[PDB]
Amino acid sequence: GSEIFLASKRAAITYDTDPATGEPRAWLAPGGTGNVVAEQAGVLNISWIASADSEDDRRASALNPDGVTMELHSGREILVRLIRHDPAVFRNVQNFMTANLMWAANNYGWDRWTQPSFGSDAREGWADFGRFTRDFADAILKSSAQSADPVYLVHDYQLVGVPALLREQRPDAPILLFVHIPWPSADYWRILPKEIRTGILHGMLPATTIGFFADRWCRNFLESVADLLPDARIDREAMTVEWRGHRTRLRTMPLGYSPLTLPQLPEGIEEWADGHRLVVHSGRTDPIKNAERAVRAFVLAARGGGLEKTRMLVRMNPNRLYVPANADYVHRVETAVAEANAELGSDTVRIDNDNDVNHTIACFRRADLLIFNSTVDGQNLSTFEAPLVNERDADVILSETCGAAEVLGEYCRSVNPFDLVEQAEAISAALAAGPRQRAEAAARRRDAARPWTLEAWVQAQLDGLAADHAARTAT
Amino acid sequence: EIFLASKRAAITYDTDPATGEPRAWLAPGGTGNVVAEQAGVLNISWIASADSEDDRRASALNPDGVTMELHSGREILVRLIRHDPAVFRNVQNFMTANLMWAANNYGWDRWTQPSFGSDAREGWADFGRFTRDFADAILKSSAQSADPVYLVHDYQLVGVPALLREQRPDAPILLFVHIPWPSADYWRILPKEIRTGILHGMLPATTIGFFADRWCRNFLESVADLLPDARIDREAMTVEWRGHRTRLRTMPLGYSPLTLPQLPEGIEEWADGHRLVVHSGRTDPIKNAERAVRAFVLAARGGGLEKTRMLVRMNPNRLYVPANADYVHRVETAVAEANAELGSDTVRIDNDNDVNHTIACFRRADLLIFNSTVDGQNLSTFEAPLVNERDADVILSETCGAAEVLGEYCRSVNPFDLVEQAEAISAALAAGPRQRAEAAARRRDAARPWTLEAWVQAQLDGLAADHAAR
Ligand SMILES: [Mg+2]
Ligand SMILES: [Mg+2]
Ligand SMILES: [Mg+2]
Ligand SMILES: [Mg+2]
Ligand SMILES: [Mg+2]
Ligand SMILES: [Mg+2]
Ligand SMILES: [Mg+2]
Ligand SMILES: [Mg+2]
């Protein structure tokens, strides 16, 4: 008897002609939070509320106020309702400063000794955060104006301010906030300026349920609350916060993959890899993906002997390259690859860069060894998808700091992503292992990965939120 | 019989001006002076590392111990361990902002550093040898003792308790760490054999002490995270592991009354007619002088600081460590940029290890800034208000151990937020004599009880209770 409203900020939508119909088409770039949320919209048969961040988006939204019919990579179709944030007030929706600070904080990118140093920009950014949060919350509230019993599913870190605003207007509504990124240790969270470190928590706590992909993130969130909000009472065993009349439950809801989204190799790759064992590292152009260290670990593994007919493919998916840290990462990866080739012989290691899902899947299929060695990762879905499609009983080296390691770590070669020697030794061992050992390990790994579907995760959201809503009422 | 050990002893060997005989004296400040003063308090020898040929010569020539003069005036015996020089050199590298200093004092960005190679494997091996040298020295000194008590000080000796416990199953062993303990997620940046091996080395202690509750909490979380076989109790502050029961204790330290002069050359004249902001600390990136200078510039831009100057007092220490050299460069850069904007000679750097100069700067200050990025405790934030003659406000980082005792009596700041720090500089200097007078008196009252002798008593009392429980 409830209507469900699902929102997230980022929607990477292209507009082109549909070859099937010859009509103008909206389609969603693959990967990122957007693809996950869009698939959830499809599972639930509801619209996806997200931000218009271009004239094209505004134009599409104005012509289709009921929503734009959008095509997923999985071929599936949903309605997307893009919020037409006023272009004169919100000049650049694509990049919000406060959200970018939260990205760096939550993914641990600062050394503290030299960075960060917050100036007036952080104050201005926080004011802008407030304006955007209000504009977004108002759009959700307008969308749900004809609903007597709305259920709000608010997705990802850009919307951390939203639950407080929804709770103010809809005191009895079930509200889930689901964060797709890590939550950092209390000492690290409090690097942020006082108004932001506390303000964000004030924005989140009015949610019925706060979800993360991993237990570690829930624990770190609770510790952050205990550290900063003298008014709050945490219960580490119950995973609860009680604060200013808000009761909040923290839940872990792991996600692995979408079965319905699971081709030929990129140009030149099949011939280059022929007769060689192939090590594959795959991920976005983001320093957390840790390809530089993966390449250096490969070089150290080769130094120990036994990798004579082995090559390494670094698959990088271009994304937000305008961010200085991302550009720096690509530079550092290119440098390590050049050093590897200088040391091991030309063409031992190759970078292959695009956002083509078919190429990604092909590379997952061809791999003799898969490396997902993130410095940290909210979850990392590639580490579920890859073994599920791999045909060669490839081993998987998985960083212990990926959310996914809580589910898959015991079925992979779990590593410290900062230790090049451990990683080199894991690379050597994985490639030395005989086919029967690898076959049995891969079968167990597929069995461990298989249950963690997008639909199961959506069900977890609803089951958790429903239970927490009941508990909130009883208290 | 109490046995006391710590690694670092910065000793100078010269001729005693009063007697003409050979003399050994200990550098003031740092952990060495603290442990040396504790040896004096307890009337015991201090076991420490010989770190140079002169130390080895002195140790070899005086096997009973080297009579060593402390800055406070006192005299104690130091028993210096002659390690293998190659092992020692590499271990000292392991203990600097390479490796362990960055691990416990939060110096890594994770995205680009660290990346552990074979050097970390060799470093760990050498650390084991160094640890064995210390345990053998301590055991040798205590071998005929029926009921020895072991007080093992600071992070370099984290491996020692396990080795002592192996030989002395029933002995009281305190491990007291003088630096922070990092969050669990940060601790596990270290290679597996190190992150776990260090915990295995520490947990056999009867008692593990830190200067702050936060460090104890972070330690427990690290144990819970890495040792599936350990059981922690956050309320009892205990670890139960392999039938070892370990108690975690917070034992704050503030200052030594006995250690509490003229200003350095040129400073008095330069400061005359001006309000003086003083930042003081070792050449270590945790001391955060660069951000303090930038915050000062931001405050000066706002007006109201027209007759205000800033003194950056830096105590040269291990300038060969890249992170320390970089820190000094960044501070020099910020000071030059401050002067280029605000006017020549607005900000000065003054560098030496003269305690008298430090105390004098504390006395002269109209505002004191101890804005460390993190600090195991920071003793300067107790010493400075207790000697200051201006009722200077204190800007104190919330990330100093000392903030747990003095935070509410100072202007507590986020050390990464320049605007907050600038606003605190401005507010601190907007208040004249009387406003500050009341707060300054309450601050001194808060700082006063936290003496060195009280802290030594806390060590003994805590250890005794924990030993009787185990
Ligand atoms: Mg758009
Ligand atoms: Mg931390
Ligand atoms: Mg985890
Ligand atoms: Mg890659
Ligand atoms: Mg010496
Ligand atoms: Mg040392
Ligand atoms: Mg951390
Ligand atoms: Mg210092």
From Swiss-Prot, chain A:
Q: Per UniProt, what is one Pfam family of this protein?
A: Glyco_transf_20
What residues bind GDP-valienol, as annotated? D156, R284, K289, R315, N319, R320, N355, D356, T360, L381, S382, E385
Give GO terms: molecular function aspect only: alpha,alpha-trehalose-phosphate synthase (UDP-forming) activity
User: Does the keyword Transferase belong to this entry?
Assistant: yes
- Reactions performed catalytically: validamine 7-phosphate + GDP-valienol = validoxylamine A 7'-phosphate + GDP + H(+)
Give the EC number(s) listed in the UniProt record: 2.5.1.135
Q: Which family does it belong to?
A: Belongs to the glycosyltransferase 20 family.
Q: What does the record give as the function of this protein?
A: Involved in the biosynthesis of the antifungal agent validamycin A. Catalyzes the condensation between GDP-valienol and validamine 7-phosphate via a nonglycosidic C-N bond formation to yield validoxylamine A 7'-phosphate.
Q: What is this protein called?
A: Validamine 7-phosphate valienyltransferase
Origin organism is: Streptomyces hygroscopicus subsp. limoneus
Which gene is transcribed and translated to give this protein? vldE
